[PDB]
């Protein structure tokens, strides 16, 4: 059903994120892993983003979305929810859009392009298409590996989830 379709789609996108392969002297580019976008970067149609969207009832979530367009007339994006049950194309200010990484950082060659242990991030929560505040528990050891994170979770006495795995595609700065 929908849930299978969604989860599959999430994995496809995580798995297909290209590994940054530099040669000696190169530095990892903007949007490689944890390296942020350039100032006044504008994401391109088709690019995945974390988008801060307000429901009709006022509830704010960072959702997984795709850019449709950007208007320099208004400095607003249009973005679609990656979930087909999200039937609203959202008009969003730049500060409500965080571009997802366009390359995975290889821990074995460019570890400075990974988030450090205990850094605060927005991470996609397992089985959801939404991003939530979390601390880095462990960076990936190999190129194929996920981050381990502790989500802020007040259902726990210490305020944190157990370590949960999140792919590089889905961890961005908070």
């Amino acid at each position: 059903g929908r849930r299978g379709v969604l989860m599959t789609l999430l994995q496809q996108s995580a798995m297909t994120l290209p590994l940054w392969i530099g040669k000696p002297g190169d530095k990892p580019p903007p949007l490689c892993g944890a390296i942020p976008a350039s100032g006044d970067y504008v994401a391109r149609p088709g690019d995945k983003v974390a988008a801060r969207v307000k429901a009709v009832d006022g509830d704010e979530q960072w959702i997984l979305a795709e850019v449709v367009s950007y208007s320099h007339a208004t400095n607003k994006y249009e973005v679609d929810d990656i979930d087909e049950e999200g039937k609203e194309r959202h008009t969003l200010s730049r500060r409500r859009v965080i571009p997802l990484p366009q390359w995975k950082a290889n821990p074995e060659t460019d570890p400075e392009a990974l988030f450090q242990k205990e850094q605060l991030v927005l991470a996609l929560y397992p089985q959801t298409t939404c991003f939530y505040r979390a601390l880095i528990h462990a960076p990936p050891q190999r190129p194929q590996d996920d981050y381990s994170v502790l989500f802020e979770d007040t259902s726990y006495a210490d305020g944190y989830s157990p370590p949960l795995n999140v792919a590089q595609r889905y961890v961005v700065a908070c």
């Binding site: 969207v53 979530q61 997984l64 990656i82 929560y125 089985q127 959801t128 939404c130």
Partner: peptide, 4 residues
């Protein structure tokens, strides 16, 4: 979207 699917939320937590």
């Amino acid at each position: 979207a699917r939320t937590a």
